[PDB]
Structures are given as C-alpha cells and as structure tokens.
Amino acid sequence: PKYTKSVLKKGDKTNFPKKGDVVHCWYTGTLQDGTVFDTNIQTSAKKKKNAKPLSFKVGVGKVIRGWDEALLTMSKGEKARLEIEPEWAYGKKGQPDAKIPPNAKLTFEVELVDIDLEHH
Ligand SMILES: C=CC[C@@H]1/C=C(\C)C[C@H](C)C[C@H](OC)[C@H]2O[C@@](O)(C(=O)C(=O)N3CCCC[C@H]3C(=O)O[C@H](/C(C)=C/[C@@H]3CC[C@@H](O)[C@H](OC)C3)[C@H](C)[C@@H](O)CC1=O)[C@H](C)C[C@@H]2OC
User: What GO molecular functions are on record for this protein?
Assistant: First the structure.
C-alpha cells in the first residue's frame, strides 16, 4: 500500500470526514531516520487559547495525497501514525525548505481534533 495507518488513540468510531469537509489536526512529521521536520504542536508556554490546529478542506488536493487519503479513514478524536510512501508525499522533488530529500517515506502522527461538515 501507498500508506499505512496505526491507531495510537481510538476516535469516536462515529464521525468520519467526507470529501469536502473541513478537518482540524495536530501533527508531527518525521523522516525515517527520526529527524523531526515539522510540527504544529507548540512547545512555548502557549498551548490552549493561543495555538490553533491545522485546518483544511479534505479530499480535494489541499494536502499531500497520503493525508487526503488517510484522513477519510479516521474518526473524530483519533490519533494515528501514518507512514506515507514518497509518491503520496513529495516524491522525487522532495521539499527543500523543510529539508525533505527526494524519495522520502514520511511518518506523521496526526490527531484529528474536529470536523466541520462542509460537504453539505
Ligand atoms: C498560506 C500559506 C500557504 C499554506 C501553508 C501553511 C499554512 C503552512 C503549513 C501548515 C506548513 C507548510 O506548508 C507550506 C509546510 O508543511 C510541511 O512542514 C509538512 O509537514 C507537510 O508536508 N504538511 C503539513 C501538514 C499536512 C500535510 C502536509 C501538507 O500537505 O501541507 C499542505 C501542503 C504544503 C500542500 C501542498 C500543496 C501543493 C501540492 O503540489 C503539494 O504536493 C507535493 C502539497 C499545507 C497544509 C497547505 O495546504 C497550506 C498552505 O499551502 C512541509 C514538509 C513543508 C511546508 O513548508 C514549505
């Protein structure tokens, strides 16, 4: 498969994003060697009432393929470890600014915090 998902914390098994919904996520991205290339989890004395999760419309190409596909399988509250093959991430180009090399399998911890039913 082009990604794998391991559930770290079960969601509500009830509310799954549909294409066109807006999802709200916390994440940490790592390379296979363990290098953290990004996180939106704030470590400054900021937390609640300062930092906001990442919001995007799901299933329409706004994120790398691995995320767009995996999110549709997650329920609200779920925290999962996604291992995304390069073709469903940054492929041959990589991403120079984030120091992601060509052909990089990416690991993301993703927590789906909320869903707005924008598919309506
Ligand atoms: C208003 C400003 C623009 C706006 C940018 C921001 C808000 C800042 C944003 C949080 C983080 C950065 O995004 C620029 C940053 O995120 C990474 O650190 C990262 O962890 C990552 O991979 N993420 C973020 C978390 C969701 C999955 C994935 C993604 O898919 O992110 C999306 C993404 C980059 C999609 C492209 C779209 C075009 C395709 O061609 C390409 O396909 C190859 C994939 C993000 C969320 C976009 O929807 C939102 C934006 O564009 C990259 C390693 C390097 C990149 O910095 C350079």
Answer: FK506 binding; peptidyl-prolyl cis-trans isomerase activity; RNA binding; signaling receptor activity
DSSP 62: S
DSSP 69: H
Cα 17 to middle of ligand 1, angstroms: 19
Q: Which domains does the chain have, with CATH numbers?
A: 1-120 (3.10.50.40)
C-alpha dist (Å) from residue 26 to 1, 46, 89, 102, 117: 24, 14, 18, 25, 19
Q: How was this structure determined?
A: X-ray
User: 16: which 2 tokens?
Assistant: 């799954």
| Residues marked as catalytic | 27, 37-38, 64, 90, 108
**Tokens (6 digits) for 46:** 């900021």
